[PDB]
Amino acid sequence: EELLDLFNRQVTQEFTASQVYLSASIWFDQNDWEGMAAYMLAQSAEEREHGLGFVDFANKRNIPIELQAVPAPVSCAEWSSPEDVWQSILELEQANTRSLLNLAEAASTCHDFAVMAFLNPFHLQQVNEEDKIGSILAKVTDENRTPGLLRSLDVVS
Amino acid sequence: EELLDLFNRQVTQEFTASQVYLSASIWFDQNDWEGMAAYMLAQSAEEREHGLGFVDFANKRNIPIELQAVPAPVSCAEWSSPEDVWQSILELEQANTRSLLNLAEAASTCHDFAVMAFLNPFHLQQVNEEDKIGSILAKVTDENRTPGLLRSLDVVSF
Amino acid sequence: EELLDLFNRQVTQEFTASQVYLSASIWFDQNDWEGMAAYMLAQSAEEREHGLGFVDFANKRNIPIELQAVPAPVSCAEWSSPEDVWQSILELEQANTRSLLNLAEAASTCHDFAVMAFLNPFHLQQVNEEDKIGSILAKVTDENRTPGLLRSLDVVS
Amino acid sequence: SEELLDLFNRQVTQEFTASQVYLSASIWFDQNDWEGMAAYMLAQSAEEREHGLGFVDFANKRNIPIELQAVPAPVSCAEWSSPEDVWQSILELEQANTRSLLNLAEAASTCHDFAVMAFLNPFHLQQVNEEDKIGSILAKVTDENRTPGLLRSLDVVSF
Amino acid sequence: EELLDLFNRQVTQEFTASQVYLSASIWFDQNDWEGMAAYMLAQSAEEREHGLGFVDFANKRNIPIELQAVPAPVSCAEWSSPEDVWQSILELEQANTRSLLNLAEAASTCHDFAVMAFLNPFHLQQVNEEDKIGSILAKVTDENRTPGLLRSLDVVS
Ligand SMILES: [Fe+3]
Ligand SMILES: [Fe+3]
Ligand SMILES: [Fe+3]
Ligand SMILES: [Fe+3]
Ligand SMILES: [Fe+3]
């Protein structure tokens, strides 16, 4: 069943995103961007909580869960500036949104009303998340046009 | 119309479930499982509340409600152990779930977005209810393997 | 450099352990041992926090961290009773202890006093964790000699 | 006092027109990720609408007929490209708002309508404060916008 | 003996450092960087307190202490900008860490477990102090790329 397989891959996707946020924290902390690092660390935790949510629902609903590897984050190897990091995180959130939308499609095809209901808050959360990341990325891209200025976003905010 | 019929039948299923839980509470009380009896009594009241919620929504949405009989419960003629009661209550919740899904399917066919939205919290509640009853039945079935041990479920929890 | 490699592997081991504990919670929840499931979930969180503490220290100490894959837990394929799960968790904590000891050994060799100091509370925590898991496993093993008895004591927890 | 009754009715429209232009500014700022400036505009939008409601309440009490007109579509958003453009349009809006109220007070003065002139006094003084506040913001925005990225500071810190 | 001489010279190093931090406060104050000046003054007091801790332990352990002169700070004649000050302070903390690491080596060689235990919090504090100073220096160095911008680090933060 497409639906059971996708529900499992959603758990992996949440944990994958958690680890990618952790890699963003690390790059920021290594590069003395402690404010952005804390933001990424908080978002790492929150993603993991989302994965845990999906696991809990699956257990209740008898959707078998088999935990997959969480792959090593790949984007950090090539980030060189905060703009690079934030662009990768926007791309992650966009991918997280698609995965959830595909899962909802599969649920809709199956008439799985409970799964569709469970997913509603996550669809609305993703709208907010993509908006928030895109907005920070816009500020970062504007501020980084003047040397040193972005270092103000971090220290302030 | 199918949606209107299924929405009435839902009120009926909630009130019928309420009575079946009441029946289970009686069986337990009569057999000195006061803890399981109190649990069933609480669930009886809650399933009546769900029915009342459906009635309220229907009144607001001009869905005509014709209250049907609540049939005499009959599974409590045959119960001879707590496991038998909990199995029936599991089957009851599985029937409750099915009736909500039937109603949602009809709302979906009709593009009745308001009804589908109203139903969402009930779909999620049924997931929790079937899980919870399933888990209790697993405990009962395991503990009843040693004589007297299930009386500990009743006294300790519940 | 051996100390750096080992410090990275320790991060990996904490996050691996975190995932094995999650696996344990899933098995328990699926088999209606909700109390044991909650215990495993809490431990899963805590071992991820340990990982985070290693990453934080590394960042401060300029120990480069590159996040590795977190492997798929595999023991939940073979579990068929709580005893099996708790035994795998004991072995996991024994392995967590060994990785910390390998790390400390390398730091000692390198005369890395700060790393050794950082490790001390973890060495002491591992004593506690192996003792606690050993104690639960003994209790589980003894209670399950009578059908149903073990269930009655997940329920009291 | 047909002139006066007319202009008083017309002042409701002006307040609601201003409310919508502020809303428009809030939208432009949100769409372009100036959430601080967007919140300021949204608040002013609400306050403009309250001013209109005050006019309506007073008219009801004074038996000045109110007939609600179309609230015109804001149009300056088509051509805004930077925050400076937006704030300049909002200054123009407030200057127009001030003139409309002074034209109304002129018609009242002519009619010896002491009550209407008294009703308007706090509004004349509010407009003084609002043109000053907007002009001051526009001066800041214009200066900060001389260095790339710096204005994005104002939004994030202040606002 | 060498452990005893090194313990004495650790006291001197702490007081030396306190005076270098004082010098940094003076340069900042003189050049109207009141925020950085306050940071340096606070760090000067703290390093004097570390020296006092060493003295107190020495007295307890019958390690004779003979207070040495506190040398005049020398870097404060060359400093021309905040970057130069923070760089000298990083170097000071790097020297602080090396002095503690030499003392720990001597104690290790002597099997002096009490001295090693006493030093552990200091080892971990140095990790934090070098990270914090290095991070500030990174911020200073970036922000100073734009005329006047650094003067906002100070007044704001
Ligand atoms: Fe997420
Ligand atoms: Fe119900
Ligand atoms: Fe751990
Ligand atoms: Fe107004
Ligand atoms: Fe010190």
Author numbering:
A (entry chain A), C (entry chain E), E (entry chain D): 2 to 158
B (entry chain F): 2 to 159
D (entry chain H): 1 to 159
Task: Please give sentences taken from the publication describing this entry.
Ferritin from the marine pennate diatom Pseudo-nitzschia multiseries (PmFTN) plays a key role in sustaining growth in iron-limited ocean environments. Typically formed from 24 subunits arranged as a symmetric, hollow sphere, ferritins take up soluble Fe2+ and catalyze its oxidation, with the resulting Fe3+ being stored as an oxy-hydroxide mineral in its central cavity. The di-iron catalytic ferroxidase center of PmFTN (sites A and B) has a nearby third iron site (site C) in an arrangement typically observed in prokaryotic ferritins. Here we demonstrate that Glu-44, a site C ligand, and Glu-130, a residue that bridges iron bound at sites B and C, limit the rate of post-oxidation reorganization of iron coordination and the rate at which Fe3+ exits the ferroxidase center for storage within the mineral core.
To explore the role of site C in iron mineralization by PmFTN, Glu-44 was substituted with glutamine and histidine, residues that occur naturally at this position in other characterized ferritins. Three crystal structures were obtained from E44Q PmFTN crystals soaked for 5 min (E44Q Fe (5 min)), 45 min (E44Q Fe (45 min)), and overnight (E44Q Fe (o.n.)) in an aerobic Fe2+ solution. Reducing the Fe2+ exposure time of crystals to 5 and 45 min resulted in iron bound at sites A and B at lower occupancy, with the inclusion of Asn-97 in the coordination sphere for Fe-B. Site C remained unoccupied (data not shown). Iron was not found within the B-channels in structures from crystals with shorter soak durations. Substitution of Glu-44 with glutamine resulted in the loss of iron binding at site C in iron soaking experiments. In the E44Q variant, this rearrangement occurs ∼75-fold more rapidly than in the wild type protein (and ∼30-fold more rapidly than in the E130A variant). The overall mineralization kinetics for E44Q PmFTN showed that this enhancement does not translate into a large increase in the rate of overall core formation.
